[PDB]
């Protein structure tokens, strides 16, 4: 029960802190020393090298921010020729699902047991241990890595074989995006119709229209004086990011053919707050776009 | 403690039947002869007219399909005039809030005490008395109005004044008209992807996807035995009247200058599944749109 | 050869003055006195009311804002009442075709030949006698009309009977409304992907993508130096108006069942615009969505 | 002046076939026989391979169907190593700017003078050797090959730099499928309101609402003759291959951040008709969205 850890940014930090204080040893890797240093003074070593981290290792997982990243490091010279033998890979960023199915098959192609394994949940769950796992993979590797993801998460969903879990992601992301600005949108309507929002957000809640959002995650400020809307769109999970997901189901959609006009619209919405300046703020920002006052 | 009820449609037929059932003595009028029969026959007595029925009435309450019958059956000779001295008015019907503030304030101008209380729920919900109200108007009449409310339905939430009912109900609908299609569209990605349909839903069931319709109304067949999808998309909600609703959701962003864009979508690809000849289907069929081989 | 002129806007005054300049008499009224000045001086008569233009004259001739106005003057005591026994009505404001048809049969009821006469061009075209006629109604009238037209205008098209002058113009408009931001959206992706605005514009105005805005009215900054875009989007067609024409096109399609997705994601995208204080602003400021360096 | 011609597809063919008829001689390659069976009736001899009909030539010309094939013939092994010293290499396949971009700077990496001179025409263009050429790359390459593309081609653009004859191709492409939408959307929903259809076409053709498709592409049957909309859509540019070229656009626009709103609804409605089994006919076919009737 030795552990690799690379990449230790926003959800990286910690959740490899939780596994640190479930009693694991961890290698540490990230180009950022200051986050390295985050680990080591929680009482993980600093491994030279991502390589270095590695070697020595049971299992190894990775929570980069994109696909490039991860083929880069993965993908010769690449990481992945120098890795291991009975090694666990725990591949956690969220990638493009044939970013992953290739990544799987070289994992394959070298006996070790990989399992794509993206996350939900934000920087205040993988603080909290509680994130959500979609896993793709083989049963066997995912119930010889379920007592990490325990250690890291609550719900573990195995969401099928190589690359299921970058699907189920995706999928599961895009709605959001369409859920989130279907509520700002209707948000904003019944404001300007002369309804007080907390009531009108109450009301959909508990009807018909209601949706996680609505239920955790309210875009109009005051609503929930807990979310991000309530100071003004710091923190959360940025509308940088949401973009990119929103890339990735495009990009899955065009190798099925899928049609998805919602998700497709909330994309060019996300752009559109891009150019607005708002990559860095959460993305429930997105009400921005509805309420002028703000 | 005697009702006018006017119209015993799909809704109004079990709502009337409800009233009957809790110990009110009903006068009921329908443009057609067997709804007001089926009345008769559970206890109500008709009424030669609309007018009839109200000459005598403590409360009258309408159900009718739309905005112009609506205006037509209030608005002069017109039965609004021929109405009555302290007499609780409930206009049930789903209506644009222009057109029921319009109204209301008729009802202002006779003393009359009128809320507008369209409903949420289906058919199913109707029959059960498990409604939800939404209700513009006075805390005064509401009150006088609670146990009628409550006789045919549950939840009942005071959305502001005079027209606040339609504006909560069609924001509502609205957001329903998003996350169904949003729900729609990612159930269809997830499976062309190689995702199991039962297996993709769950996940985002419980997940940041998380929705009315993957709680209670997944628009794929098979996930939900229970659900329109599951056989063919007969009976439910139609969706002839989910685009009405969605049209009744556009007059009121145009009077406040809002904007839309997942609604507008939304109601866009509804009149596309009309021209397909499926306005008769329960609202999920927009799950054809992604699926073929259905 | 008598004219009642009423309505005396952006729109109205050049093409009343332009009526004078063709040797017709003229009886002047608007809301506002400094516009009834504007064409005295040019050689017109005030009329104390839009009553009292109209009696004593051949042909009357409206151009007001909006459905609401037009209904209001022509539809009782109003205007349409006191007005006239053989005399042709012109009314060229852009308004529903449902409103159109409306006092298209009023006037029926009472003899007079009336047209829906809406226009196309702008202000500068208003000015130079060089407008578009779109025209429901009678062959009969229009060729009574024909020399008017003929002093106001170029283009003079029969688009069939009562209504049809307003539905060819709101198709018309929507229409402009998707090219327009379809060009501003690729003018703004071309360029970001390196390409020279002027070059790139060429290029698709003689090919494919070839439309009227890249001919006349390139929405990109300095392309046509002689385009609204060129002086920051001061003057020419306001924003606001075309989110009302956009907003006339969802009407007629919901009588109609039509689904109209581009036009109406374009609607939704005027009104961001509005929101984002652009009101005022020439309508090819729908640029501003896609380039923040302006 | 001998060529190597890869690819002789729907206007791989044609194309080789005006450079014979313009006196070039030519090395013929294509993975199916009775296309090279085709243009060596027409006086060219057949290549054993990609490879060998490169071999002893002055330019190499490949018209292929998409990014993979492309760059898998130019980049190893791949044909791109075996090709050769001051030849001209023209790539008229319509592929990713980034995919084009790529293999310009390889071609660098060889001294070979490479140009990205995607078409856009019809199979009815590249027949009539009328096709418009937008050209990556340096003048200098350009002015050595102008006198083939004006054998094959009209309108020669130079569009940029490596890779931006790709970019103005799908830009221009992009807003093509915006204005046929919008132009089958407009026909749609005033014919729905009364209006005949020859007539609706001419009036937005002649004004604001003018576009490429309604000069020259009607999508509403009967209104050109001429069109694969009056022959039920067949032949002419296949709905599929429009898809593919929306899809590039999206992976442009992923690159800069750009938004599409147009482009995307654009691209979700093409992958719709592709469900209800209509790749393989023109893309005007977008029309059926709007009329049942059909
Ligand atoms: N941040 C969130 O709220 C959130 C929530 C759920 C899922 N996700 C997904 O998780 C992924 C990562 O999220 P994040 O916010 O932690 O990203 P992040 O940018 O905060 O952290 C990434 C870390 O990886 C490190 N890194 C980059 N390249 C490396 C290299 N090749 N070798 C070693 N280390 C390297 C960086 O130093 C950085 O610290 C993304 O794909 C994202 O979509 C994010
Ligand atoms: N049906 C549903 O699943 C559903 C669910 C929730 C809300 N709603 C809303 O409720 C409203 C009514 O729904 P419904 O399904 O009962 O409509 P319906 O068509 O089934 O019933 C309307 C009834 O009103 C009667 N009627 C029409 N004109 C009349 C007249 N002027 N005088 C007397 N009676 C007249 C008709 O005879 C008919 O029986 C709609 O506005 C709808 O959007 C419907
Ligand atoms: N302005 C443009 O560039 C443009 C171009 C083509 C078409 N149109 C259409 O033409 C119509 C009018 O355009 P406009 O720009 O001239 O509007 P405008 O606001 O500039 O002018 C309207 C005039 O009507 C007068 N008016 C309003 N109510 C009146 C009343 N009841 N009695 C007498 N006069 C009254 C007002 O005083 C005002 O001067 C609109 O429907 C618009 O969509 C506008
Ligand atoms: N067809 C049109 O109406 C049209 C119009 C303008 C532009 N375009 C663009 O032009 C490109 C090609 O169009 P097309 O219709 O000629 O495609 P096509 O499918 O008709 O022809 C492609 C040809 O390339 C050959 N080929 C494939 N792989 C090969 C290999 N590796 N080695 C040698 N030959 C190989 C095939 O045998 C085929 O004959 C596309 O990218 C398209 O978007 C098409």
Chains 1, 2, 3, 4 share one sequence.
Not at 78 to 85: C, F, M
Not at 146 to 166: S, W
Request: glycine share 10%; aromatic share 6%.
């Amino acid at each position: 029960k030795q552990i690799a850890f690379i990449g230790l940014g926003h959800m990286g930090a910690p959740m490899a802190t939780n596994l640190l204080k479930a009693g694991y040893l961890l290698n540490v890797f990230d180009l950022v020393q200051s986050a390295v240093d985050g680990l080591v003074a929680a009482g993980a070593s600093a491994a030279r090298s991502a390589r270095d981290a590695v070697q020595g290792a049971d299992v190894v997982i990775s929570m980069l921010p994109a696909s490039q990243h991860v083929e880069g490091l993965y993908l010769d010279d690449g990481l992945l020729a120098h890795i291991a033998p009975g090694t666990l890979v725990l591949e956690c960023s969220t990638i493009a699902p044939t970013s992953a199915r290739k990544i799987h098959a070289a994992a394959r192609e070298r006996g070790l047991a990989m399992l794509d394994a993206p996350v939900s949940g934000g920087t205040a769950g993988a603080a909290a241990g509680t994130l959500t796992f979609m896993v793709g993979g083989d049963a066997e590797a995912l119930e010889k890595a379920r007592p990490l993801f325990e250690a890291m998460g609550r719900n573990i969903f195995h969401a099928g074989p190589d690359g299921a879990g970058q699907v189920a992601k995706v999928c599961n992301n895009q709605l959001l995006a369409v859920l989130m600005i279907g509520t700002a949108e209707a948000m904003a309507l019944g404001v300007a119709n002369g309804l007080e929002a907390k009531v009108l957000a109450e009301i959909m809640r508990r009807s018909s229209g209601g949706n996680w959002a609505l239920e955790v995650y309210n875009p109009w400020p005051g609503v929930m004086e807990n979310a991000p809307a309530s100071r003004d769109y710091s923190g959360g999970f940025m509308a940088q990011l949401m973009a990119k997901d929103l890339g990735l189901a495009q990009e899955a959609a065009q190798a099925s053919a899928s049609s998805t006009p919602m998700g497709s619209l909330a994309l060019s919405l996300y752009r559109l707050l891009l150019k607005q300046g708002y990559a860095e703020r959460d993305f429930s920002v997105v009400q921005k776009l509805f309420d002028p006052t703000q």
